[PDB]
Design a protein around this ligand. Structure first.
Ligand SMILES: *[C@@H]1O[C@H](CO)[C@@H](O[C@@H]2O[C@H](CO)[C@@H](O)[C@H](O)[C@H]2NC(C)=O)[C@H](O)[C@H]1NC(C)=O
Ligand SMILES: *[C@@H]1O[C@H](CO)[C@@H](O[C@@H]2O[C@H](CO)[C@@H](O)[C@H](O)[C@H]2NC(C)=O)[C@H](O)[C@H]1NC(C)=O
Ligand SMILES: [Cl-]
Ligand SMILES: [Cu+2]
Ligand SMILES: [Cu+2]
Ligand SMILES: [Cu+2]
Length: 497
C-alpha cells in the first residue's frame, strides 16, 4: 500500500539481500526501496520521520529530502543537511509538514545526509492529479506501475575506500536484481500487465550514481511526464535516465501474451545481461511463469533525445532569446582535481550552522554566509540563467536544483539552445566535454536552495553550491516550527559541538 499524505515513517537498520548478498542497510518503512508516499496535488503532507538508527557504520543521524517538491514557504522542511536543517538524531522524530500546491507528477524521497541514501533510504513519492490532462491516455496508474531503478553496493557507503574507484555490485529494478560478480539466480522483479490495457509507468531513478539505458523488449514507451512536468507525447524505444530523474510513459500491453525482458543498463558496473543481471520481467496475465526469451535490438530505433521533449502546457522560457538574456546570468566553473569537485574554485564542505539558520540569525549577504564562497545570492523576482559547461571528470553529471524546476535551454550533446519550447525539469545531464547545458528559472521562492550533482559520491566530494534566493525575504517567507528550532541544539549536544 501507499502511505500518506499524513504518515509516520520509521528509519531503521536491517539486513537485506536484494541480489542474494546480505548486508545491513538504512531503510524507510522496513523495505528497499521504501514505501511510496503519495497524495493529490495541493495536499498537506505531514511525514513524521522517526530516526531509529543504531548502527554508526551507516550514520545514526538522518535527514530526508522530498526531491522535486518546491517547499515554497517551508524551506525548513526541504531536508538537505546543513543547508536547511541539522540532522535528526537517533531516538528522536521530526514532522516534515508541507504542502504541494501547483505540482503533480512523479517524485522521490531520499536521505540528504552524506552518502546515506546509497545505504538504502530512498523511495518513490507520487503526487496524483485528479484532473490530470493525460488521464485519458491510460487505464492503470497505481503502485503497481511505479518502476524504480537503483544501484546497489556490497560495500557500505561510509566504508568505500579513499582512492579506489566506486562502482556498484547490482542493478535493482523494483528492489530486485542480480549481482554483477558471483552472480546468483536470485529472484527478479515482475511487472504484470493485462493484454489490451494501457499503463502509466512511473519510471524513477533512485540512483546514487549510474545512468541507465532503460528499455522493454518488444515494446515502446510514450513519454508523458518529465521530472514532474507534463510533456507532449513522445514515443521512444529506449530512455537514458540519469540519477534522480523521472519519466512517466504509457506502456500499451499490445504485444502477444508472454514474457518480455525489462532492461536497465548502467553506464558503469556490469555490462550486458548475462545471468539475468540488469534485468526484470514484464509478464502478461496468462503467460507462462518463466523467463523471457526476447532480445534487445543491436541498435535502438528511437532513443530519447532531450531536445525532442516539449511541455504539454505553454511554458515558454523566461528572459530573452540569447545567451545571457536574463536578469542574473551566471556561468559556473565546474571542476574536479585530486579527489574533490569545485564550483567557481570552491569545494563544498557542509557548514556547522545550517545556511537557513545562519540567515534567520541575521546573516544577510552571501559573503556573510558559510561556507565561504559556497553560497551565492539570487535576487528576487528575477530571471536567472545558469550555464553549466561540462568537462569535469566523472561525467556525465546530472545537476539538480532544489526549490525549483527549470527550462533546459541547452541540452547535452547539442550546441543549439532553445528559447521557445524546451522541456522543464529538475535534474539535467550536463553532457560531455565542450557542452554548455544551460538552465533558466524565475526567483519566486525565497530560501537557500541546494544546486548539486546528483551522483551522491560527487556531492560528498564537494560538487555543490547553495543559491541563497531572496535573502531579505527568507525569514518572513519561511516561519519555522519549534521542532525545527530544536534540531541544531539537540544535534550539537549529541555530537559535542
Ligand atoms: C556557455 O555559455 C555562456 C553564456 O551563457 C558563455 O559565457 C560567456 O563566456 C565568455 C568567455 O568564455 C565571456 O566573455 C561572457 O561574458 C560569457 N557570457 C555571455 C557571452 O553571455 C560560456 O563561454 C559558454 N561556455 C562554453 C564552454 O561554451
Ligand atoms: C538540437 O537542439 C535544437 C534546439 O532544441 C533542435 O532544434 C529544433 O529542432 C526542431 C525539430 O526539427 C525544430 O522544430 C526547431 O525549430 C529547432 N529549434 C531550434 C532553436 O533550432 C535540434 O533538433 C536538435 N538536434 C537534434 C539532432 O536532435
Ligand atoms: Cl528538489
Ligand atoms: Cu531535490
Ligand atoms: Cu557528478
Ligand atoms: Cu538534493
Amino acid at each position: 500500500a501507499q502511505i500518506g499524505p499524513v504518515t509516520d515513517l520509521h528509519i531503521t537498520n536491517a539486513n537485506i539481500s536484494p541480489d542474494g548478498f546480505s548486508r545491513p542497510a538504512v531503510l524507510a518503512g522496513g523495505t528497499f526501496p521504501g514505501p511510496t508516499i503519495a497524495g493529490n496535488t495541493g495536499d498537506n503532507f505531514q511525514i513524521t520521520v522517526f530516526n531509529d538508527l543504531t548502527d554508526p557504520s551507516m550514520l545514526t543521524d538522518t535527514s530526508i529530502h522530498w526531491h522535486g517538491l518546491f517547499q515554497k514557504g517551508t524551506n525548513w522542511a526541504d531536508g538537505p543537511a546543513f543547508v536547511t536543517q541539522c540532522p535528526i538524531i537517533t531516538g528522536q522524530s521530526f514532522d516534515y509538514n508541507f504542502n504541494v500546491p501547483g505540482q503533480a507528477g512523479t517524485f522521490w524521497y531520499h536521505s540528504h545526509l552524506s552518502t546515506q541514501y546509497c545505504d538504502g533510504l530512498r523511495g518513490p513519492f507520487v503526487v496524483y492529479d485528479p484532473n490530470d490532462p493525460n488521464a485519458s491516455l491510460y487505464d492503470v496508474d497505481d503502485d503497481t506501475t511505479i518502476i524504480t531503478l537503483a544501484d546497489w553496493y556490497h560495500t557500505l557507503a561510509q566504508q568505500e575506500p579513499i582512492g579506489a574507484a566506486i562502482t556498484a555490485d547490482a542493478t535493482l529494478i523494483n528492489g530486485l536484481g542480480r549481482s554483477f560478480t558471483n552472480t546468483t539466480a536470485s529472484p527478479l522483479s515482475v511487472i504484470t500487465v493485462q493484454s489490451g490495457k494501457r499503463y502509466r509507468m512511473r519510471l524513477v531513478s533512485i540512483s546514487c550514481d549510474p545512468n541507465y539505458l532503460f528499455s522493454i523488449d518488444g515494446h515502446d514507451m510514450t513519454i508523458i511526464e518529465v521530472d514532474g512536468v507534463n510533456s507532449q507525447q513522445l514515443t521512444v524505444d529506449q530512455i537514458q535516465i540519469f540519477a534522480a530523474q523521472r519519466y512517466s510513459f504509457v506502456l500499451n500491453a499490445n504485444q502477444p501474451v508472454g514474457n518480455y525482458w525489462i532492461r536497465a543498463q548502467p553506464n558503469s558496473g556490469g555490462q550486458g545481461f548475462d545471468g539475468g543481471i540488469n534485468s526484470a520481467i514484464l509478464r502478461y496475465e496468462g503467460a507462462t511463469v518463466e523467463d523471457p526469451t526476447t532480445t534487445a535490438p543491436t541498435t535502438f530505433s528511437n532513443p530519447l533525445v532531450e531536445t525532442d521533449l516539449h511541455p504539454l502546457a505553454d511554458l515558454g522560457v523566461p528572459g530573452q532569446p540569447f545567451r545571457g538574456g536574463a536578469d542574473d546570468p551566471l556561468v559556473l566553473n565546474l571542476a574536479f582535481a585530486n579527489g574533490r569537485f569545485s564550483i567557481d574554485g570552491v569545494s563544498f564542505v557542509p557548514p556547522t550552522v545550517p545556511v537557513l539558520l545562519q540567515i534567520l540569525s541575521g546573516a544577510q549577504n552571501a559573503q556573510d554566509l558559510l561556507p565561504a564562497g559556497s553560497v551565492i545570492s539570487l535576487p528576487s523576482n528575477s530571471v536567472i540563467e545558469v550555464a553549466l559547461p561540462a568537462g569535469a571528470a566523472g561525467g556525465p553529471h546530472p545537476f539538480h536544483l532544489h526549490g525549483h524546476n527549470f527550462a533546459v535551454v541547452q541540452s547535452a550533446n547539442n550546441a543549439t539552445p532553445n528559447y521557445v519550447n524546451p522541456i522543464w525539469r529538475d535534474t539535467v545531464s550536463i553532457g560531455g566535454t565542450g557542452d554548455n547545458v544551460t538552465i533558466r528559472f524565475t526567483t519566486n521562492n525565497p530560501g537557500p536552495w541546494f544546486l548539486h550533482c546528483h551522483i551522491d559520491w560527487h556531492l560528498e566530494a564537494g560538487f555543490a553550491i547553495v543559491f541563497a534566493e531572496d535573502i531579505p525575504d527568507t525569514a518572513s517567507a519561511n516561519p519555522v516550527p519549534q521542532a525545527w528550532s530544536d534540531l541544531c541544539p539537540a544535534y550539537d549536544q549529541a555530537h559535542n559541538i
